[PDB]
Design a protein around this motif. Sequence first.
Motif, short mmCIF file in Angstrom:
data_model
loop_
_atom_site.label_atom_id
_atom_site.label_comp_id
_atom_site.label_asym_id
_atom_site.label_seq_id
_atom_site.Cartn_x
_atom_site.Cartn_y
_atom_site.Cartn_z
N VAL A 380 0.69 -1.37 0.01
CA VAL A 380 -0.15 0.06 -0.01
C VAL A 380 0.99 1.29 -0.13
O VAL A 380 1.93 1.25 0.50
CB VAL A 380 -0.93 0.08 1.26
N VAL A 381 0.44 2.31 -0.60
CA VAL A 381 1.14 3.65 -0.66
C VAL A 381 0.23 4.54 0.13
O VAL A 381 -0.94 4.76 -0.15
CB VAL A 381 1.44 4.04 -2.00
N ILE A 382 0.98 5.55 0.79
CA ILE A 382 0.29 6.32 1.69
C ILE A 382 0.87 7.83 1.26
O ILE A 382 1.81 8.27 1.77
CB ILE A 382 0.66 6.20 3.22
N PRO A 383 0.34 8.61 0.29
CA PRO A 383 0.48 9.79 -0.11
C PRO A 383 0.64 10.73 0.83
O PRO A 383 -0.15 10.91 1.77
CB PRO A 383 -0.40 10.16 -1.15
N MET A 384 1.72 11.39 0.96
CA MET A 384 2.14 12.60 1.86
C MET A 384 0.78 13.56 2.27
O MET A 384 0.86 13.91 3.44
CB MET A 384 3.46 13.49 1.32
#
Length: 865
Positions: A380-384
Amino acid sequence: EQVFHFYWLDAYEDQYNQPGVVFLFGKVWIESAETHVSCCVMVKNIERTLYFLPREMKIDLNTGKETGTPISMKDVYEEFDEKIATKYKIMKFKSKPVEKNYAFEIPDVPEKSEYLEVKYSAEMPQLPQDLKGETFSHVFGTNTSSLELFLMNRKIKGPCWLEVKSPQLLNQPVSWCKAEAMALKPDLVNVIKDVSPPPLVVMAFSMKTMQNAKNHQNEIIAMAALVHHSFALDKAAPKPPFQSHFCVVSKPKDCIFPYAFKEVIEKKNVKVEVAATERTLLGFFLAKVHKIDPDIIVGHNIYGFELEVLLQRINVCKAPHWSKIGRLKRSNMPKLGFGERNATCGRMICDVEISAKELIRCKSYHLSELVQQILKTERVVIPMENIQNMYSESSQLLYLLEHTWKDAKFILQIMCELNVLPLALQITNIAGNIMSRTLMGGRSERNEFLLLHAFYENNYIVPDKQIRKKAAYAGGLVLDPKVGFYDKFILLLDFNSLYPSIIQEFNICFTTVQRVEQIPELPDPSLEMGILPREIRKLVERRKQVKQLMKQQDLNPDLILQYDIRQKALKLTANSMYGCLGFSYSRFYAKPLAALVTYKGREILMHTKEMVQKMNLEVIYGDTDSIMINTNSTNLEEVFKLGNKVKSEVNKLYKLLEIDIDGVFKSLLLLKKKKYAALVVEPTSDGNYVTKQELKGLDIVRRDWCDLAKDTGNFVIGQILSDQSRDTIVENIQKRLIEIGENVLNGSVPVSQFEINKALTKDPQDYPDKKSLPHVHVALWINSQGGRKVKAGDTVSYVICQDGSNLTASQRAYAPEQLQKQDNLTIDTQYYLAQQIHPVVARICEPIDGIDAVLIATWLGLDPT
DNA sequence: AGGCGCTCCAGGC
Ligand SMILES: Nc1ccn([C@H]2C[C@H](O)[C@@H](COP(=O)(O)OP(=O)(O)OP(=O)(O)O)O2)c(=O)n1
Ligand SMILES: [K+]
Ligand SMILES: [Mg+2]
Ligand SMILES: [Zn+2]
Ligand SMILES: [Zn+2]
Ligand SMILES: [Zn+2]
């Protein structure tokens, strides 16, 4: 006397502030505690070692004419003692005559000669490199560093056990290690080889940053770390890869943690330390590194980002004890991975991104891409952006914290999967360089160390250190292909370790080939094998052993991959040894030798081609050391017989060089030199076989074409290599392309398939003609826009969009996020159908009768003109 | 800072 045992791992020198001193870092067994701890051993009084070459006849320096009086070592000794030492300010020194061999690029230096070896404090003045005298014509070693002298003189070849005789105490501690000791001279340190290696402490970590509301600053708000205190490098990674871990979370400034958070933490029981300020978070992390005292720190994109952001923030927040991130107590913090590599002095840094680039190929080396290819899981990616909204609620901050932990774990698992540490150790013991340098990548420094040890060992004077381009000589021969599709079995023969074998087979070496664009002559076959062929030979034998292991009875799929990576690593090492000969900045640069090796290779390929032809065989292709043959047969067993037959005929001509059956294809689509597809035969039982598709150089295998274009191209290839009649195939192809064309227009295609990837050769700021280079343009945005920053070597992902600005496609490049988020931006369907899919399919169908470029355009609904 | 051989694309002339 008195002696203690020490297993060294890292070394460091500061030639400016502490010449003649080398700091060693490693492990010591502490019986009372039944564990190994860290130890720093400071080695002092490593002396400069110079070699004065005596002139045949004495010379007068005021007139510049000979005198008639020959020379003797007494002559040289006296001149150094009377004029040189005195003139250059050398109070003390020791000397002795010795006999050394030479075989490098300085003219007027004899193969064998007597020299006056002089040694004196590295604290005393350094003599000019071009220094000459009345009795000597040249002087070697004036600029050799203490670290090189130490490793070469003590014969240290990578991490190993050492005995330090007569250790001394230090008035004051110089490191952050548990133990310390000091050696007054290098000869008090000796390598011992009969004690098993100690296990190491390995720490894997990851962090999260957040752009601050007002001021422009990347604030660290979370860190996770996994640790193993007994990670052995001479065996399979431990399962699980870590024994403990910790997390730390902090608030930006204006934010406030969700409430009950503390309790929420106590509730779920997570070893998470909630810091109140970034400064606290940093102070805490450093305290943890000091206490855990890892020998190896592993991360992802450490050298390019994380490490620099950590040091800068540590400096900005004025965090306490920054040097604890390394093992050497320092005061001033250096910046910009030089200043970085130094900042962690004593601790090896393993960056899986860097290691992956060296051991395998990927479209990108970003963490998600690596977790997918190597661990076969999604990340999973957690955008800033979404980060901020997370502080609002407890579960969100907790989720972000668990995410950081997951990345630390992914990183560690990737390291174990690629078997990075054991490999790096093996390469370091072979080259005899420093393990932390091995882990930074690069083949040249290793090859240099390997040669330095070999020549010191054979009593040779070595060259002094000195202080993509256009080819500078001829390379391999690539045969002109007979383009087309093939139905019958194809035979592919390939020479084993060609270049390394050519070097041995003809005894090519710095010591056996005369030289000074001209190809030197092969040395008289009577001459004894030189240093280069011997060293090269050892790399080839090691590789054969590993290949023998793979050949073994039923093995794990995971282990088989590790053996395959290792086998290729040893192949690359041997080929890099050939390559450095042609590396202009190499310490052992010898272009004529490189050119001779390539010359014999082309010669050998030509003869092998002509030979297969005399056997009335059809040679349809060949690359450098391979020959492709159209057997026109449909009988597998017969083909194999023909293969072993040609093999035997070829190998008959050489002492060491051996050709083999690389493979057999059931069908082959040969498009151009270095570009082809094929169904590869894989025998089972009773002459039965399965078949596997294999691509070489097609657009389908490249990173700079989108998945849409590449998956479609792979479909066509699968159909062409098929059993189906040519008719059925051409129909299927049309049927599918027409469909793809529709899906692209109706918006059925997942946005990710439109992504194109390119790596930047330079930092985005270093491009003059930027704007029209889509990848450089998206990088400049990404950079100037938020946190992380793209630099030379990184790959950038982008999509071509309808701006509503009539600029060329190359000037309408955008980031995936930038598209999905922005409304005026939309996928330029026209671009993808005509500049991505069409070009790929057209090149693939080029030789297929029935398909054509104009036709492919009509399937895609494009105006053929 | 291993080597060299062989396409591919954007763009202006
Ligand atoms: N990364 C590479 C690959 C190849 N070569 C050169 C040297 C090799 O000797 C020759 C042949 O390429 P191969 O792929 O066949 O490599 P080898 O023949 O040496 O190893 P193998 O036994 O696997 O065929 O091309 C090189 O310099 N660097
Ligand atoms: K065609
Ligand atoms: Mg080969
Ligand atoms: Zn001992
Ligand atoms: Zn170019
Ligand atoms: Zn080959």
